[PDB]
Ligand binder design. Structure first.
Ligand SMILES: *[C@@H]1O[C@H](CO)[C@@H](O[C@@H]2O[C@H](CO)[C@@H](O[C@@H]3O[C@H](CO[C@H]4O[C@H](CO)[C@@H](O)[C@H](O[C@H]5O[C@H](CO)[C@@H](O)[C@H](O)[C@@H]5O)[C@@H]4O)[C@@H](O)[C@H](O[C@H]4O[C@H](CO)[C@@H](O)[C@H](O)[C@@H]4O)[C@@H]3O)[C@H](O)[C@H]2NC(C)=O)[C@H](O)[C@H]1NC(C)=O
Ligand SMILES: *[C@@H]1O[C@H](CO)[C@@H](O[C@@H]2O[C@H](CO)[C@@H](O[C@@H]3O[C@H](CO[C@H]4O[C@H](CO)[C@@H](O)[C@H](O[C@H]5O[C@H](CO)[C@@H](O)[C@H](O)[C@@H]5O)[C@@H]4O)[C@@H](O)[C@H](O[C@H]4O[C@H](CO)[C@@H](O)[C@H](O)[C@@H]4O)[C@@H]3O)[C@H](O)[C@H]2NC(C)=O)[C@H](O)[C@H]1NC(C)=O
Lengths: 359, 359
């Protein structure tokens, strides 16, 4: 089923939730990838220490092969991350920017009741040069209390990173531009008798004189207006991410002016297409992943093919784990105390290496 | 002179420029620090290759000392960056969020001319139960063309990262909240004759009947209103970053409700106080910086004090540069071609290390 999340956007608040949720999804993809690289670099420092601490030549070559393998794949994956990272961050910033815009518009569009000021009565005056009575109001205002978006359990279940994988997203839903640009209001004028510049009794926030001025045009002559409501209705719009053929982004820029929804759909499409490749996690490497890794052929040939690799790293995963993986979190190093991996990510990392390479 | 940049904020557009400029300043501080770390890690990979390519034991120890020194300071500086990074990013996100808000409010507050709709005439009706004539308008709107902020040369010279060092910043200036929450308008009603529900000639966007209805209340009886302008005036406000004593952030959260300006001032204060420590640039290391570096005492003692260091790295900077710095960009490595530093940041980094450690 496609477009579960976008198909749940029906209001300004759910567009805000979609936009923020998708931005956080892209941000989290980058953070996860960068965490995988940092873990790999921490593994490389750990093996560097173990390589300096081993006396056996072939075991030293074994660690060196893990160092070389790790450097190759992690440097490559870090370089490869840069394009997708920038593409995804471009979309996340724009989505956050849109959600801010919409939240600000929502607060203003909630200002739906006017407070009248005290008017001033006149005769003919611009823009009613032909009137015999005018009632002029300055500084009518409308303000709402602080608005907040409330989400139900299902809003948060449907508009969710779990439904934002690229394979299920074909469109975005946005609030129409009028909500962000247009003030709307209703107003009504009322007249009774012969209102003039002498209609200067203002106690009812209108212009009255004659008889007994009072509530509900109590007086003989009365003129007034009210702004009886404000607020522009939100509408929704759909925008496709892809061309009709399905591969290419719709709404590429540079082809003429675009609306906000079109610019957002383009950025979302590109961010969806910019898949991240995460390299192997070195800290949980298995024997089979190592010897079947394509980079290990030339590395093992340089240092020692798959028969040679097993000869270096173990015939089973159990002994590979014991010799090359478990020491990272379990082997203690003390000199003048910490486990290998934490030590080589600590303030004493360099000093532990110098101490053991010199000893 | 303090507060050059904030003292130049006098309008919504210059607050937007300040907020975006400061966010980019914090972002650039993080990027610069991370670039310095990446350069250092690239130096460490380069020395790792040279250490594998050297035949002399003491020259191998020399490279190892540079590796150990680089790992220590760069891992430490990377760990130390994390708190300040998050503090600065918190402020940059909030400043961008505010600038978005303000730009959206600016577009709405620019909608200063109303378009009247065709009214409907009535007699007495809510909210004028006492009127004999009413003229009711639904869906009056106000919309502006697309707004943009224009900056002068001096706006960009004063509101500039060059004036945003922590030592010169004591306050921020923000637009008052009413600009973001309140619609303001002027309106006027006009009456002539005896307008009633029969005043149903609407050609002038008012209610007329009798005689010859026409422009300027041409008819005998007329009722109408106009919204003659809209728009809320921007005002500015100052908020101090520090308490009266000058050390501590003012506007710490958790002490009661806060306004937007207070939350922003707190984040800006904390981001200003969260100074980043950048480590030595390994790729341009001098001899004197190396031997005077505090970490090199224990490292050199472990591998080889300052007399020992000169013995290992050179008596002059010229020979230190030749032996340990210049080979990074100048020494070519070829096997089955690239300079050392680029090779060890390339897809063949790991393989170059394996090849030379095995040879
Ligand atoms: C969040 O909400 C904010 C607030 O509304 C949005 O911010 C607005 O974003 C739009 C789109 O990015 C901005 O419009 C752009 O404005 C720039 C600059 O325009 C000014 O400077 C130009 C020279 O630098 C000048 O040519 C312009 O003057 C022309 O245009 C005006 C208006 O049409 C016209 O009156 C003039 O006579 C000129 O003809 C102007 O002075 C402009 O460069 C951009 O142009 C590109 O895009 C449009 C639309 O695709 C296209 O027509 C062009 O051909 C060109 O390709 C564009 O107009 C706007 O200024 C922002 N408003 C504010 C207050 O900041 C923001 O987009 C929202 N974000 C999200 C993610 O939702
Ligand atoms: C950009 O512009 C946007 C749009 O205006 C700004 O977004 C607004 O930000 C403010 C401040 O962060 C948001 O207000 C917060 O709202 C949350 C959630 O409130 C709702 O949920 C609560 C439970 O989760 C509930 O208690 C709330 O109900 C109470 O409050 C309302 C309103 O006062 C009242 O009517 C109720 O009866 C209850 O008494 C509500 O349903 C809330 O948790 C926050 O409270 C903290 O902060 C306030 C002020 O410091 C303080 O009073 C509290 O004691 C508490 O410490 C806060 O109210 C607001 O919802 C956002 N609006 C929208 C549309 O998103 C944004 O801040 C701008 N950014 C920048 C950087 O300029």
């Amino acid at each position: 089923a496609k477009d579960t999340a976008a198909g749940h956007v029906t209001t300004p608040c759910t567009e805000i939730l979609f936009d923020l949720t998708l931005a956080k999804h892209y941000e989290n993809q980058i953070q996860a990838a960068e965490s995988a690289l940092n873990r790999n670099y921490a593994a490389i420092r750990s093996w560097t220490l173990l390589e300096a601490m081993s006396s056996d030549g072939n075991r030293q070559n074994a660690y060196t092969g893990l160092i070389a393998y790790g450097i190759q794949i992690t440097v490559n994956a870090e370089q490869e991350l840069q394009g997708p990272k920038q593409t995804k961050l471009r979309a996340a910033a724009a989505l956050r920017h849109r959600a801010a815009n919409l939240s600000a518009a929502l607060q203003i569009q909630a200002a739906q009741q006017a407070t009248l000021t005290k008017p001033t009565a006149g005769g003919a005056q611009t823009p009613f040069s032909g009137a015999t009575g005018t009632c002029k109001y300055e500084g009518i205002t409308a303000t709402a209390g602080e608005q907040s978006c409330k989400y139900s359990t299902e809003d948060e279940e449907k508009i969710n990173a779990a439904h934002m994988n690229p394979e299920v997203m074909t469109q975005i839903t946005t609030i129409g531009d009028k909500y962000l640009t247009t003030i709307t209001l209703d107003a009504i004028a009322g007249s009774k008798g012969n209102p003039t510049q002498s209609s200067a009794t203002y106690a009812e926030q209108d212009c009255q004189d004659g008889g007994n001025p009072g509530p509900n045009f109590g007086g003989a002559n009365a003129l007034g207006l009210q702004v009886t409501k404000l607020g522009t209705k939100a509408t929704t719009e759909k925008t496709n991410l892809y061309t009709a053929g399905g591969t290419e982004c719709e709404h590429q820029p540079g082809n003429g002016p675009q609306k906000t929804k079109q610019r957002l759909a383009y950025l979302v499409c590109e961010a969806n297409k910019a898949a991240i490749i995460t390299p192997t996690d070195l800290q949980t490497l298995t024997l089979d992943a190592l010897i079947s890794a394509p980079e290990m052929a030339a590395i093992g040939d340089a240092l020692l093919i798959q028969q040679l690799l097993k000869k270096a790293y173990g015939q089973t995963n159990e002994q590979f784990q014991k010799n090359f993986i478990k020491p990272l979190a379990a082997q203690t190093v003390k000199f003048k105390s910490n486990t290998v991996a934490a030590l080589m990510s600590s303030p004493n990392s360099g000093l532990a290496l110098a101490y053991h390479k010199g000893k």
